Amino acid sequence: AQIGPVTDLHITNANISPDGFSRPAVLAGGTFPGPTIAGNTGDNFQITVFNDLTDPSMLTDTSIHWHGLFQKGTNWADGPAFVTQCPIITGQSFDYNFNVPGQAGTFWYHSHLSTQYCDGLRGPFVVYDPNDPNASLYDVDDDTTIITLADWYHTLAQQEPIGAAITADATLINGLGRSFTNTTASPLSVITVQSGKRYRMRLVSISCDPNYLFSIDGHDMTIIEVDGVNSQQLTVDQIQIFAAQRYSFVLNANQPVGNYWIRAQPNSGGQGFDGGINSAILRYEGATVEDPTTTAPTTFSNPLVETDLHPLADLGVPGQPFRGGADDPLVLNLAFANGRFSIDGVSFVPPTVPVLLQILSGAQNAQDLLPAGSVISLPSNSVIEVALPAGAAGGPHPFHLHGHNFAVVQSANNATPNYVNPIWRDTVSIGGTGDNVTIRFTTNNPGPWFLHCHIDWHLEAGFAIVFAEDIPDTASANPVPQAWSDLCPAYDQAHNI
Ligand SMILES: *[C@@H]1O[C@H](CO)[C@@H](O[C@@H]2O[C@H](CO)[C@@H](O)[C@H](O)[C@H]2NC(C)=O)[C@H](O)[C@H]1NC(C)=O
Ligand SMILES: *[C@@H]1O[C@H](CO)[C@@H](O[C@@H]2O[C@H](CO)[C@@H](O)[C@H](O)[C@H]2NC(C)=O)[C@H](O)[C@H]1NC(C)=O
Ligand SMILES: [Cl-]
Ligand SMILES: [Cu+2]
Ligand SMILES: [Cu+2]
Ligand SMILES: [Cu+2]
Ligand SMILES: [Cu+2]
Numbered sequence: 228a229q230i231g232p233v234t235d236l237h238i239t240n241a242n243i244s245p246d247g248f249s250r251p252a253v254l255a256g257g258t259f260p261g262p263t264i265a266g267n268t269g270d271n272f273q274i275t276v277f278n279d280l281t282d283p284s285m286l287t288d289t290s291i292h293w294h295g296l297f298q299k300g301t302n303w304a305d306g307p308a309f310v311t312q313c314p315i316i317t318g319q320s321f322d323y324n325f326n327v328p329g330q331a332g333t334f335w336y337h338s339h340l341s342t343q344y345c346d347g348l349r350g351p352f353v354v355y356d357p358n359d360p361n362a363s364l365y366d367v368d369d370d371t372t373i374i375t376l377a378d379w380y381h382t383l384a385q386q387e388p389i390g391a392a393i394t395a396d397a398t399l400i401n402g403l404g405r406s407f408t409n410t411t412a413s414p415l416s417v418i419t420v421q422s423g424k425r426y427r428m429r430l431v432s433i434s435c436d437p438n439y440l441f442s443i444d445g446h447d448m449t450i451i452e453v454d455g456v457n458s459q460q461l462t463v464d465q466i467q468i469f470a471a472q473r474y475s476f477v478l479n480a481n482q483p484v485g486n487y488w489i490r491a492q493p494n495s496g497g498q499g500f501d502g503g504i505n506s507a508i509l510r511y512e513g514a515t516v517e518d519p520t521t522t523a524p525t526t527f528s529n530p531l532v533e534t535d536l537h538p539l540a541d542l543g544v545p546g547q548p549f550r551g552g553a554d555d556p557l558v559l560n561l562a563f564a565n566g567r568f569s570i571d572g573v574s575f576v577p578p579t580v581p582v583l584l585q586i587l588s589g590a591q592n593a594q595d596l597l598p599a600g601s602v603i604s605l606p607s608n609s610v611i612e613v614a615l616p617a618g619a620a621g622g623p624h625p626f627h628l629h630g631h632n633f634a635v636v637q638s639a640n641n642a643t644p645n646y647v648n649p650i651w652r653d654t655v656s657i658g659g660t661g662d663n664v665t666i667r668f669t670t671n672n673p674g675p676w677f678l679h680c681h682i683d684w685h686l687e688a689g690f691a692i693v694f695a696e697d698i699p700d701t702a703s704a705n706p707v708p709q710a711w712s713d714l715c716p717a718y719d720q721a722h723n724i
Pocket of ligand 6: 623625680681
């Protein structure tokens with residue numbers, strides 16, 4: 228079952244074996260992935276997070292972010308550790324109490340402390356629309372139509388050795404899949420459909436790192452939502468999905484009753500499908516309980532290309548139709564060297580006092596805010612442009628902005644900008660060497676909003692900045708509950724800070 232919008236959520240340690248290999252994990256709701264948190268557009272979510280963690284090898288503190296939800300007036304509830312709160316300590320709980328006005332779509336939640344989400348704290352978050360403009364395109368849309376794609380590691384996140392390459396050991400689809408090495412025939416996930424019906428498949432990348440080439444043998448996929456944003460219908464036969472992105476697609480169960488491979492090929496780790504790695508099963512009702520015998524094509528006919536997507540609504544693009552045509556046009560220098568990422572020459576290291584708390588205590592320009600050089604102010608009620616030119620090692624980097632979605636004025640692998648009708652989304656691949664992926668948004672949400680690469684290993688290695696949006700109105704716009712005020716004193720006492 229789905230939980231919420233008002234629910235408890237316990238964070239525990241447990242052993243799991245999603246690929247047949249046992250290891251300890253950090254779990255929400257006792258499962259990997261965690262349970263789906265759900266409600267309707269405009270609902271009040273009250274998610275009381277109980278930190279019950281005891282194993283220090285995966286950190287006993289936690290903080291949870293609700294990825295893609297704007298948190299307008301509730302910046303304190305956003306979750307990034309040392310940006311909007313101090314972590315919750317073990318044996319304590321915290322009520323994330325917020326509203327989702329004006330949003331409906333497919334989201335997710337994840338730890339936002341260190342690389343802890345990699346250790347298991349990740350799950351879907353769905354905001355249904357009772358008046359969804361896409362409702363008539365499908366018949367079924369429920370917990371059974373959510374598809375999560377996850378990377379899974381045998382080595383614990385905190386135990387990844389300095390100086391060695393990090394790659395995953397299995398791809399998990401709906402929490403199950405097979406290991407790339409020492410493969411065993413552990414159970415695969417099954418997604419069941421009924422011949423003749425149409426399904427809103429909610430595809431969620433909960434990856435810590437790889438992008439996936441997602442496909443379903445014999446089928447094609449009609450995209451109707453991108454990172455929470457309704458799109459015009461776009462039919463594809465493969466979707467390259469980067470870490471933290473979401474799509475809804477219509478799956479028409481229009482093939483013969485049978486079994487079809489679901490494929491998710493990561494860009495690193497195991498290549499191909501030998502032994503059933505990188506795989507799940509689409510099973511029609513009435514099919515034999517056996518593995519598919521289908522193949523992929525050598526070449527896909529209609530892969531997703533981001534510039535092909537367009538909003539369903541007339542969203543346009545803010546600003547003027549040329550580079551720099553914004554109130555606050557930025558170009559970030561995104562770099563990597565010697566194990567650390569930087570933005571404009573500064574590698575992100577979380578501060579002792581959360582950015583939001585520094586603001587509430589009276590720091591009132593970004594030069595006053597710590598970490599020095601990692602916080603950039605944005606003016607209120609302004610069009611912002613951020614160019615994100617690629618080139619830094621470890622690409623393609625999926626960049627994500629908290630508190631906002633954005634128009635993707637320029638996409639990967641295409642030098643032409645689009646000031647008319649590009650998709651809006653919240654996580655975008657910045658592409659490859661020489662690209663100039665560029666985003667736009669308007670500043671109508673006071674508070675400190677994290678901008679970072681969503682490859683969690685890169686975030687940990689510094690690939691982030693904080694946009695302190697409308698510093699002057701942050702305090703008035705974001706009244707804080709006592710429990711939030713209590714977080715840092717409890718954390719600092721527990722940690723002898
Ligand atoms: C990406 O686009 C930005 C503008 O959005 C370019 O920024 C300009 O950079 C030149 C020097 O490279 C400066 O003289 C300008 O002041 C910048 N802003 C402009 C023209 O609007 C940036 O060069 C582009 N990067 C790449 C790698 O193509
Ligand atoms: C590269 O990106 C541009 C801009 O998004 C794409 O150009 C648009 O193409 C569509 C489809 O033919 C036209 O309706 C628009 O008028 C174009 N807009 C602009 C500003 O040129 C282009 O198709 C993309 N290239 C590829 C190969 O997909
Ligand atoms: Cl977000
Ligand atoms: Cu986010
Ligand atoms: Cu995120
Ligand atoms: Cu990255
Ligand atoms: Cu984030």
